[PDB]
Amino acid sequence: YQDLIGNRYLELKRGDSDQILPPGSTIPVERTEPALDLDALVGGFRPLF
């Protein structure tokens, strides 16, 4: 999230390995994660309440 209005951004974390990723590669879905997904959070409160 960038703000509570709806703007997002991409965030890159270096990791641990020193092997350089060659340019033009692809980062697999194994190490990519989405944003908050506020509707899931709000709907998860339903069983508790």
Partner: protein, 48 residues
């Protein structure tokens, strides 16, 4: 140097607990516990 958790990270952790934690089961568990304890507290005490 450090950083406070954002509202996004906090709500993401809460949502992770709420979705991957089996929250719906609670509304069953408690319900059945109610059925155990409805009108039988004195009798459970004397049974003890």
């Amino acid at each position: 140097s450090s950083a406070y958790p954002t509202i996004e990270r906090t709500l993401a952790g809460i949502s992770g607990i709420l979705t991957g934690g089996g929250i719906p089961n609670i509304e069953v568990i408690q319900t059945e516990v109610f059925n155990i304890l409805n009108g039988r507290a004195d009798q459970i005490r004397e049974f003890l």
